[PDB]
């Protein structure tokens, strides 16, 4: 008989034909999927009085467990089944309610913002409902649905109730972002943005995806804080971190100016103890709202290579040492410039100084390399200055050894960040990066949490899916929607600290990047390691930068340039194509295809809405939702395995069936040269920076040990092609 129990807890008789119908429905259009195979595996686990929800979970998992490279279409079979179960779970039926009724109910329950009902009329919601296509939920993959259900869809985390479906999320994010638009164009934009996000052309960050439409206003994910050399600034920095990590933001801290251990105690401020103690205080601030003082909340601290305590700073995450000299739960970014690299090449020494003892040096390091060398050589000979000399080879090897063993000791080439940038280094120099090393914005130290003369950088992100466009001229529409939606967001969100508001309203900085790069290269028949993708990469990143500046320029015409537009190089008629590292000319010969000189003039005359537009970030979740390869990285394998409460999550790279031999997997690359050239070509056009990785496989080297020579050679190649920063170092576990 097999009794089935329902949601109200009432008994009906099992209906095996109904189940089969759903399976047959879900399978429509898929290849190599056996409905019988799924029925055999799930029916055996049924029993008298099994709830209906449990039947749904059982068949979902059955299909999920058959996902493989040989039958990738199980990804969709499981997904559709999952979508079906979520529909019934939220609406009690498959067919979603009308938009207007849904929004009314959610506003009354306190789950949606009430401004939605004030900002749009019932007729306008009826119009919006005709845009929605609920059948687009049938295009997700199983792993995507799991992320949607896990961290995007509005739900009751305690009771496990899901209140909405993907398409209401997409339509309402659009509705909120363009709510302040004139009624003559408002809904035309709403429809276009909804089409772009629901068909995976534009990806949005997690915070936006889960919050916009709900009553919250906290959407910042990266804050850049610069700390001055004083107890008041140390306290302000610390207070600012606590406020921002409680809202789940990644922090990027510049603590380079703090004077060295021993330096003259100046003002009562016991700076006799040096950097370490204060670094430990920033670590506890970063972990202040973390479970058991270690999980959640992250930061990357930056310091110059010539700091007098650099040798103690470089081994802070070494897992072998006294607790009083170790700050293990933060990542560090070392700041280098051309002079430092020269000393290494010539086999000379590097002189270490405390920032407080060398007037003008620290600022010169970022804004003027000629003045840096002048001051640096002067102070080397000045006998009144406290200093220390170390062999450049020793310092560079100590740094690289720590980078290699932890993977988390990053590099920032400060000269490249200021000679090739959107900002004028005399007025607004770039002095640090963020958590994942792709943001590069100007900052100013605070003397108090509420100091209005300080500046904290924030950046709003998003990305273009290179696997969902047919030709590069589709980026014109996409760039308009991406820029307009994110610029609206800058006025929509809250700012807990005055200095953060200042930078956002002054410069209106954005960071739009790409996902699915590997897939894109595979379908064009190119690889990473042999130089075959150089010209296509050049051509592709010229289109992205060109259309992003165009959209921003059009927006400034309409609504005015950003208040501090005059501090940008763009304001003086200087473009990315005028300041790139000239060595790039030897590795790419593609011509420019767009009219940059027409654009040059327009920017000069009407200005830009946003000071920065592009940045290439990492991405795990966004890419999962659109079944795309992460950011610009090569896949580690054809199938991704992730752990979940419900089971093992598998995801097959896009179009594996036809492109398995076209892909070039991470550990198939012979080395980092090909990849480092592509990053250099991308950096010619990007406003900010890229999260570049370096990868090494021990089994490709004699005795299973990566030679220091190879590590330093790749460091220098990166520098030669204009790479601004370097993120993770991946070493193989084989």
């Amino acid at each position: 008989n097999l009794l089935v129990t329902k949601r109200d807890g009432s008994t009906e008789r099992i209906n095996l034909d109904k189940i089969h119908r759903v399976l047959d429905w879900a399978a429509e259009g898929l290849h190599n999927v056996s409905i019988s195979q799924v029925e055999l595996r799930s029916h055996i686990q049924f029993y008298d009085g099994i709830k209906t929800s449990d039947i749904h979970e059982t068949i979902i998992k059955a299909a999920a467990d058959l996902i493989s490279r040989d039958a990738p279409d199980y990804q969709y079979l499981a997904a559709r089944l999952a979508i079906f179960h979520l529909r019934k779970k939220a609406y009690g039926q498959f067919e979603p309610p009308a938009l207007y009724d849904h929004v009314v109910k959610m506003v009354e329950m306190g789950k949606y913002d009430n401004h939605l009902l004030e900002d749009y009329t019932e007729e306008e919601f009826k119009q919006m409902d005709t845009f929605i296509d609920h059948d687009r939920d049938m295009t997700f993959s199983y792993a995507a649905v799991k992320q949607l259900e896990g961290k995007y869809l509005v739900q009751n985390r305690v009771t496990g109730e899901i209140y909405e479906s993907a398409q209401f999320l997409y339509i309402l994010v659009a509705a909120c972002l363009f709510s302040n638009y004139p009624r003559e164009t408002r809904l035309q934009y709403v429809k276009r943005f909804y089409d772009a996000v629901s068909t995976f052309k534009i990806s949005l960050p997690t915070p936006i995806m889960s919050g916009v439409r709900t009553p919250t206003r906290q959407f910042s994910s990266c804050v850049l804080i610069e700390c001055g050399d004083s107890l008041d600034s140390i306290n302000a920095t610390s207070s600012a971190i606590v406020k921002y990590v409680s809202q789940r933001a990644g922090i990027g801290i510049n603590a380079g100016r703090i004077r060295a251990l021993g330096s003259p105690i100046r003002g009562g401020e016991a700076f006799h103890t040096g950097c370490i103690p204060f670094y430990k205080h920033f670590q506890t601030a970063v972990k202040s709202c973390s479970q058991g003082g270690v999980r959640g909340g992250a930061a990357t601290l930056f310091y110059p290579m010539w700091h007098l305590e650099v040798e103690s700073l470089l081994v802070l995450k070494n897992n072998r040492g006294v607790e009083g000299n170790r700050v293990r739960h933060m990542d560090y970014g070392v700041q280098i410039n051309k002079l430092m690299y020269t000393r290494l090449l010539k086999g000379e020494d590097i002189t270490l100084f405390s920032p407080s003892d060398v007037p003008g040096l620290y600022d010169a390091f970022f804004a003027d390399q000629e003045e840096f060398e002048r001051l640096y050589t002067k102070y080397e000979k000045d006998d009144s200055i406290r200093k220390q000399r170390v062999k450049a080879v020793e310092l560079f090897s100590l740094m690289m050894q720590e980078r290699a063993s932890t993977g988390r000791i990053y590099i920032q080439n400060v000269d490249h960040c200021n000679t090739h940038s959107p900002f004028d280094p005399a007025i607004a120099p770039v002095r640090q990066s963020n958590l994942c090393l792709e943001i590069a914005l100007p900052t100013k130290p605070l003397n108090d949490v509420n100091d209005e003369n300080g500046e904290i950088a924030l950046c709003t992100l998003s990305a273009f899916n290179l696997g969902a466009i047919n030709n590069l001229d589709e980026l014109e529409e996409l760039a308009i929607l991406a820029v307009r939606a994110l610029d609206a967001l800058l006025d929509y969100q809250d700012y807990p600290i005055p200095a953060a508001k200042r930078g956002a309203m002054g410069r209106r900085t954005l960071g739009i990047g790409v996902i699915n790069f590997a897939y894109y290269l595979a379908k064009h028949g190119k690889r990473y390691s042999d130089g075959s993708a150089n010209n296509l990469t050049h051509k592709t990143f010229e289109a992205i930068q060109y259309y992003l500046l165009k959209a921003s320029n059009e927006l400034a015409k309409e609504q005015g340039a950003c208040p501090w537009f005059n501090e940008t190089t763009y304001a003086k008629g200087i473009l990315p194509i005028d300041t790139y590292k000239k060595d790039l000319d030897t590795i790419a010969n593609e011509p420019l295809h767009y009219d940059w000189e027409a654009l040059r003039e327009s920017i000069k005359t009407h200005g830009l809405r946003n000071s920065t537009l592009s940045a290439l970030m990492p991405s795990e979740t966004s890419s999962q939702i659109s079944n795309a390869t992460n950011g610009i990285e090569p896949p580690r394998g054809y199938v991704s395995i992730k752990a979940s409460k419900d089971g093992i999550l598998r995801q097959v790279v896009p179009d594996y069936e036809h492109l398995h031999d076209a892909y070039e997997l991470l550990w198939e690359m012979p080395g980092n040269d090909g990849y480092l050239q592509l990053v250099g070509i991308m950096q010619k056009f990007i406003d900010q920076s890229i999260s570049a990785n370096t990868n090494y496989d021990p089994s490709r080297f004699p005795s299973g040990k990566v030679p220091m020579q190879q590590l330093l050679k790749d460091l220098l190649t990166a520098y030669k092609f204009g790479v601004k920063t370097l993120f993770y170092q991946n070493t193989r576990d084989g």
């Binding site: 290699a404 021990p698 220091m708 030669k720």
Partner: peptide
């Protein structure tokens, strides 16, 4: 595992 052996004579030619 790394082999800490740097040849400064080999790196010197490099052009930044």
């Amino acid at each position: 595992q790394i082999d800490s052996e740097v040849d400064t004579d080999d790196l010197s030619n490099f052009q930044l």
